[PDB]
Subunit: 445 residues, 4 copies
């Protein structure tokens, strides 16, 4: 049914070893996309101590480049995995090969060996295409797990603001170095003074102090607090902050809208907790007794912990798996009454449709004597009494009266924890109207 | 049905005296969780005047520790209260015993008697586990009262912001004391100047001025106003404010989303106030008369003050309590017509299903002469006329015409306040089709 | 039906002259609730030029006090207007008499004539109970007009922010005057300097400059901009601004939530504009022709301008007014076919139920030849052709084929603007199954 | 059907050349509405180099004025295009002629030639009525394209904030020039100092520096950041900023509400992605097997990519176009079974109602042996097996058993990609109950 593995060169994408390589390269992509604006903004050429780290950081991405010619992929309009080499290679060469290949050049060595022209350093910015691995990690997370999709959209949106503030801090520091050191007093950092400390001659301050000051400015700006102890003084800095606040206005509105859309679509538990209020306000706008309505409030409080299970599989998709699990679950404790002592298997797998499951309290009254019967009760386990018999597990009652349209002679009550099954004789009568092999064996008592 | 109180050592959790102890310890937990950051941040060791208060404040929590081995608790998967001592003790020793016990040590005396090492004072922060009583108070409030659940979620969220601003103010003051007094001018408070007052030599300013300044900074920061007369100058202070504003951005978005989700799920009164607009715009997009549509607008305005009571108990839960209250309410003013002079009790408790309650105005017209009858009217009290008889309380009409399919001879009108009951003869005919002991006695006139 | 006007002292509340007095006193209540914080905050005793205005401003409220013993009011649980004098007077004396009476005392003369004690001036603040007229004006506006209720709730909430900023500005100015003039440099205004202008000796600056500065501070604070050129320097001013920003945080969240809840509950026009997109995307996800689907898109675009009128009066309230207007509208252009040449009036007022109104385009095809008929068309006006006759106004067709279950012989098309009525013969057949006096006269052709 | 083009002077509004003129004038309207506040605010009379541009800019609007007497327009209450000259001219002369005509006067030459009175320059502000073309462009965009209406409302609202900040910057600069140059130190720009640069003698600073400073202030104010390095010092400037922040508070609340209302009305894909979670949590709250429920989860994942197509054309509008495309699509691969070898065309175009389209996986089981048949399967293409025959394209099965109420003898399974059609024999039986010409030819095998 595969039609392939006649090649034995191609890697199945859901292999165990290949999924270990994919999480190795994601950490390198996270590190490489955080270091690149710091390399562009705070240096003009790397020092000697970062040479071997800069060389090692590209070998992993070159190995990842050569691996993509050996991976099978799943087609979109069809749903078969392609195992053919030329179809793999042409899809790679038309999608992602070019930027991945030219982001692996040694751009720090080319800058130092060609007379230190500043426009050569602008090609470092194409290494920010490596966040593709992070967006593919977030795309794979939201489909196949047990967490809802809106929470992952909030976490995905929260990851974007960290990256945007870090990049804005690096660019805001870089703009101050495009003036000569003799015009230092006309920049945002060369004229800064905080406490009794002066930021003059700022190119010789160590790296983490400058980075912390720039990140402090960017994070205070992004939250719209804006103290004003650090601000812009140039025209280029004014243009940069005018672009930056316009972007994060829309970003903050998107975050607020996503959190609101999460909260508005609340859960079903509070979709019946309000119904509690409507019912008891109806019961108390006029006057009424207190005892058996407190009984029915405890009843619905334990009943709504099971009644969400009804609507999800009433008839939403027409599966025969519900017939399989219905033969699996209910009637292996219902064959044991003499009611179904000799019914055909047609009626055993036909009965299962309207056995609704509800749980009850040790203080309710089960059935009435002066009654026309409505529901038939089918017990899982029980120690429940009646005042003439005490009904136990794997039993039933009520069918002594309903088909012959008689009142029940029993006053059935409870002292224990309940698991019984509903039955209306609407479905019993209409399919007993078709098949009566059972109906002979039901009235054979 | 209890199976216990054979021990007589165990306290029922819904006792009257025990609920007085629970509100005594909640005030101590509120006080103890507000004083602990002020003790950590503004002192290095307590003075002499707080000694007896510090000793007394732990005795109540030790007594509360020894009381938890004597309280019965309600099981989760079962719903019976456990009264056994070893099952109580093992649940306490696996849940909450450790942090409650080690938060009761005298950590101020241990700090002074071991050479004043600063790391010993960090163990004061485990006394913030005593806000468990406040979150359990807010969990008990939202289930069993007459207030809706979203308003309590807004009040619960508003309590968190007070506690967060108070703790942030204490930590922001504490960070300034981790420098020596000779580097005082490189702190946020040691370099502050407001008006013509200087904050130098700040360790000798009295306590409430320092606390008020720090709380003013924290509350102005939390609302995102940010005047900038107080700000950070260090690197540790910059890192602290970078963490703090990122937290309250998400907190403010959560508050806005909760208030919006409260407002969007509006009440039913304005769910028919718009329906007023749709109906009268339909009536006025074409031309129509004015008199009897003003009648029906006053009619629906007094009718929608009762028609919310229909849907809540049509058939939502299948209770026989509605049959009990239906025998209790309606027909003790409906037996008094000669219509039901001799009907069986089966028909008396069967009739009750489709008597819908509506109230009317002193100016409407009740019934028509040239008619096929649709509704049957069953009056609570009345002084209403017809032009040949004036119908009063405990009466009926319309049944002279409907079962024999005749037109009504009466022109029934009103001058008084109305309480009558609807009836369609759909239900009357289909259950009169089953039982006619009544039907003999109805036509016995 | 009134039972009263046997008194002739009492004023009906919906009189014409009394509604002129109610709008006279509303302007005085607006003026009196804006002037009172300016009188408290910017003066210590009024000057001579405001004496006659201060005296005149209380006479109107005294006259309004004596008028409330002569107004009839509508009861709540009943809905009759009460005309009895003692029932009027006791309701006034238990609701609103006390604060209205003691807000009319001459508190400026009492302050000057009792030694100028400052605590006497605090009784001016009970004149802010006169905003009751504004909240009653906003309560009367939202019930009985043609504007929706959420827009009036937004305008009501926008009125509150103006009043809150004006009162906060007056209190913020008042706090600076509670220090002596020798400690002037320790206040927010006594130490202010803007441009090359100094605010020293601030008690002799004229009134509108001081008021404009305080209102500028309050409005910049309320919008959370916070420039920081004006700020607090005292402890009492810090406590005041800490209270003030906490209030308007919740106020701004309430405003955002109300505007969002207005926008989310959009109109029905865009509730079918999306349905346009779903239908044409279904029609274009597979391939299809272009001509007659462009016809049906123009059809539904002119059809949804009338199909909102269906659901509002299908069966929502069971009125006979729809039978009255149904005899008024449709069939006075439908009696003119020989189809209903002699039907009984029972069938004339019975037919009206399923004549749905739709409008059409000059390019559609009306009917088919090779057909089993589904709908019957009942024209208002027309010049529509068929290829053998050209059907005009007050006519019909299709009934030549449907009751005898024949195909139609006509190919009916259009060139003009359409107003015809639907009819399914489901309703025609089931009520023709009951009454056939008509059925003789229908087949009398 | 037109009734016109007997004039040959009038231009049809959907001509090809006229739609080229409409986009030419939109660029001139955008330029003219951006230049006018810069001409009012930063100059007192234009210089010599802008003379020919100022003259040329009005000739296009004069030509556009004379063109509007020759355009046909579509009536509102009718839907016919009017081609009559006097009806065109009177609508123009009552709607838009006056402001368009008097905005074309040479107001720069009139100011210089009448003694330079400043009130003459205020008539430049009536050229801001030319944004009518931009609001008509945004009105035409949102009706007839493939983008949803709420996204265009967000983009329309984002365009307003750019125009409002640009106009506010020009007015804020203009207010500083209304004082003499000797009171320069009492303005916002004449007292400004940034870094080591001073803004004194500000009328001789070049234009783009002044404009960039004013726009930086306005954009920082609009986002509610508010650094405070530029602020107001006068009373007129205070009044202007008090008006401006009150406007953009409501504007920001409107933007947040629109984005939230976009996000809350999410798409249908995540309206079944939650249903995945509810179904598998129902299947895993009790214990169950893993194999065939993983089958049905892959089934519903490929099934919900087609089941949105059902509800949109079940019965929403009653079109015969669905009968036309139903004869076009399905049964030209269903005539090829001997099941419909000789049925009448009535049954061929009657069958089409309940053939629902679903797609399946290469691993499912199609049918059962021990069965009462529910659905009938009608294949597009297939290579599917049974264990006795391998069923291919243009075939069917299941009808060997269902009409005679027999069990199926086949165990039908799959290995390929599925396109089969559902059929319940409810519709087959009820319309086979009417027409049995087919029923003879179905049982003719
Ligand atoms: K802000
Ligand atoms: K600020
Ligand atoms: K701010
Ligand atoms: K500021």
């Amino acid at each position: 049914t595969d039609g392939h593995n006649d090649y034995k060169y191609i890697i199945h994408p859901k292999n165990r070893w290949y999924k270990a390589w994919e999480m190795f390269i994601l950490v390198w992509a996270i590190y490489s996309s955080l270091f690149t604006p710091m390399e562009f903004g705070f240096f003009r050429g790397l020092p000697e101590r970062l040479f071997v780290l800069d060389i090692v950081g590209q070998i992993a991405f070159l190995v990842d480049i050569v691996l993509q010619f050996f991976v099978a992929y799943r087609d979109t309009q069809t749903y078969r995995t392609v195992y053919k080499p030329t179809r793999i290679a042409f899809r790679y060469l038309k999608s992602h090969f070019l930027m991945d290949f030219i982001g692996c050049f040694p751009w720090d060595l080319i800058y130092k060996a060609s007379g230190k022209h500043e426009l050569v350093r602008y090609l470092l910015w194409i290494r920010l295409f490596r966040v593709r691995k992070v967006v593919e990690f977030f795309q794979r997370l939201e489909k196949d797990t047990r967490i809802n999709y809106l929470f992952t959209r909030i976490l995905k949106l929260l990851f974007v603001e960290v990256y945007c503030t870090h990049t804005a801090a690096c660019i805001f520091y870089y703009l101050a170095t495009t003036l000569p050191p003799e015009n230092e007093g006309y920049t945002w950092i060369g004229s800064l003074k905080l406490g009794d400390y002066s930021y003059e001659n700022f190119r010789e301050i160590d790296l983490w102090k400058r980075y912390t000051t720039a990140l402090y400015f960017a994070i205070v700006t992004m939250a719209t607090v804006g103290y004003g102890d650090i601000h812009a003084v140039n025209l280029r800095e004014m243009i940069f902050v005018m672009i930056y606040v316009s972007f994060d206005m829309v970003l903050g509105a998107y975050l607020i809208g996503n959190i609101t859309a999460l909260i508005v679509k609340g859960s079903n538990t509070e979709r019946f907790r309000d119904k509690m209020n409507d019912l008891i306000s109806f019961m108390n706008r006029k006057k009424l007794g207190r005892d058996l309505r407190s009984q029915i409030t405890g009843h619905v409080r334990l009943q709504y912990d099971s009644h969400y299970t009804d609507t999800v599989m009433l008839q939403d998709i027409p599966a025969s798996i519900r017939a399989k699990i219905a033969q699996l679950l209910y009637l292996p404790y219902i064959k044991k009454v003499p009611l179904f002592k000799g019914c055909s298997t047609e009626f055993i797998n036909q009965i299962v449709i309207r056995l609704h499951e509800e749980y009850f309290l040790p203080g309710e009254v089960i059935t009435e004597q002066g009654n026309v019967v409505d529901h038939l009760y089918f017990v899982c386990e029980g120690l429940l009494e009646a005042l003439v018999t005490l009904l136990g597990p794997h039993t039933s009652f009520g069918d002594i009266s309903i088909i012959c349209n008689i009142s029940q002679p029993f006053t059935v009550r409870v002292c224990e924890l309940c698991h019984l099954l509903r039955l209306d004789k609407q479905s019993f009568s209409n399919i007993l109207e078709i098949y009566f092999h059972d109906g002979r064996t039901i009235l054979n008592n």
